[PDB]
Design a binder for this molecule. Structure first.
Ligand SMILES: [Cl-]
Ligand SMILES: [Cl-]
Lengths: 201, 201
């Protein structure tokens, strides 16, 4: 994630003919402390993952830190920054690490007293499959200023915000997202499967 | 809503034999400013309404104000207090008013600049079907201290929190809630309908 957003794609990515541009880019703007983003990601994550796998979409994630403050031990910014650290090593590891932070067992309550510290974030990055420069990147706070400026850069102050090809998308169910994507990329292999299993989780 | 919770039931309420106690009480602990509660209510509301209509559950709502602050113009507490004002007049009006505040067109962004003032809340109460003592109840801040103390009283500091017969319920989809309720009250008229239409919204 170079680059304000971390882009997640598979080798099956369906592109616009005559280009290397994805036909459908779903943009997600999220805060790791936001309980609404937690609900969204736990509900939609598998379906988005499947849309990526079959090549139907590129999934771009911009981890903002709008909830960050001393009162939450800077969890919003440290987690977002950690995700960008992880993405530097491996896109696949970012995928697991991003899913991990929004999982019910890990995401901290917004107004609670306990939040993963930097050592815990590094440990979760390790579990996601990467070390490399992550521990230094996290401990040094390499991406703190970056993530703290992201909300202003993309004009997002409510999360999760989703766009489909740049246009605001009023999401509802994962099955409806599959339907929306199919209107753009068509009946590509795996999409009806993605729809049917989205209707059942 | 007497009473920490506003209880919503229909005349079809299935009760424990030898008692006037509902066989299934679903307890909801919510903050009107909480975006997660907005997502939950928009996704689950119709299904809960149907469970109430067919008599499968009593739905008890405790409107906490954990997000309240001057930075949001006290929207959390004023809205919760308004809902209790509305409930004093009519349970049906509370149902509509509660659904109205969580609707996508009305619920304010948590970190935004604009929030319904007391005049707007009174106007929404009117649209929900009631006047009576509501304008005075709201303008006087009759229930502000009450709602500001609710979170501590029920020990809830994360919303939405749901309990089924007093036991914490890790909610997922409205169809799963129907399944859970059916385990308690059985195959009462309308419940399979509620399940099937829950699987489709
Ligand atoms: Cl990779
Ligand atoms: Cl009534």
């Amino acid at each position: 994630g170079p680059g304000d957003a971390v882009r997640v794609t598979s080798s099956k990515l369906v592109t616009q003919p005559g280009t290397s541009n994805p036909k459908a880019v779903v943009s997600f703007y999220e805060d790791f402390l936001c309980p609404a983003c937690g609900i969204f990601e736990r509900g939609f994550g598998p379906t988005v993952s499947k849309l990526v796998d079959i090549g139907a979409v590129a999934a771009d994630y911009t981890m903002v830190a709008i909830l960050d403050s001393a009162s939450n031990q800077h969890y919003s910014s440290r987690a977002a920054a950690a995700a960008y650290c992880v993405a530097d090593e491996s896109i696949e590891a970012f995928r697991r690490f991003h899913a991990a932070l929004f999982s019910k067992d890990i995401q901290p309550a917004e107004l609670g007293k306990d939040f993963p510290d930097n050592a815990r974030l590094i440990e979760l990055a390790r579990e996601a499959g990467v070390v490399g420069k992550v521990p230094d990147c996290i401990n040094s706070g390499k991406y703190i200023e970056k993530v703290d400026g992201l909300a202003a850069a993309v004009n997002v102050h409510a999360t999760p915000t989703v766009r489909v090809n740049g246009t605001e998308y009023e999401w509802s169910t994962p099955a409806a997202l599959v339907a929306k994507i199919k209107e753009i990329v068509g009946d590509v292999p795996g999409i009806d499967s993605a729809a049917a299993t989205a209707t059942s989780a």
